[PDB]
């Protein structure tokens, strides 16, 4: 099923959650998403979609999650290259820079700063060639494509712009498409009411790429339906 899961808030309110997944499915199955923003000169970790200050330094949290056994880090703030440069020597784990960029000149800055992968979505659908550009420039493994899907008229449809726009593109075709383009991994998110396991079971046979399940589970109970 899913090869990896991402987590954020649930990891902050219980760091032992990271250890539990990692001891159960391997460290490589744990992706910790970290939202950060400068507060009083230093980078602080933020939870709940960046609305609540954790009171934890980005420096401390990055180090904490690795010792907890995290596999890689999804970092977010044309890229906050200063923050990426800050995080880079603090950990040896793979760093995925959360996108928003839609040009190669911005992608180059992320990898230059220290990122191992980038995560694209909306930019990928309107410009599928971007995937091939990053994959030929930095390798297939450096390209992570985030897909936000939802049930529409009995078919899984792809949604963009933070899940607000219906692209009219089928999830089946887009998954097949992105791997043709040269994507390395897929980050799957459902806008449908935990874990949409039906969607994951749908996407799974359609690709041999690693699938990263986006959730909101707070317990080991729900994190297992993903795998």
From Swiss-Prot:
It is found in: Cytoplasm. It catalyses: 5-[(5-phospho-1-deoxy-D-ribulos-1-ylimino)methylamino]-1-(5-phospho-beta-D-ribosyl)imidazole-4-carboxamide + L-glutamine = D-erythro-1-(imidazol-4-yl)glycerol 3-phosphate + 5-amino-1-(5-phospho-beta-D-ribosyl)imidazole-4-carboxamide + L-glutamate + H(+). Pathway: Amino-acid biosynthesis; L-histidine biosynthesis; L-histidine from 5-phospho-alpha-D-ribose 1-diphosphate: step 5/9. The keyword Amino-acid biosynthesis applies. Keywords: Amino-acid biosynthesis, Cytoplasm, Histidine biosynthesis, Lyase. One of its GO terms (molecular function) is imidazoleglycerol-phosphate synthase activity. The keyword Lyase applies. One of its GO terms (cellular component) is cytoplasm. Its EC number is 4.3.2.10. The active site is at 35, 148. One of its GO terms (biological process) is L-histidine biosynthetic process. It is an enzyme of class 4 (lyase). Belongs to the HisA/HisF family. Heterodimer of HisH and HisF. This is Imidazole glycerol phosphate synthase subunit HisF. It comes from Thermotoga maritima (strain ATCC 43589 / DSM 3109 / JCM 10099 / NBRC 100826 / MSB8). The chain holds residues 96 to 216 of 253 of the full protein.
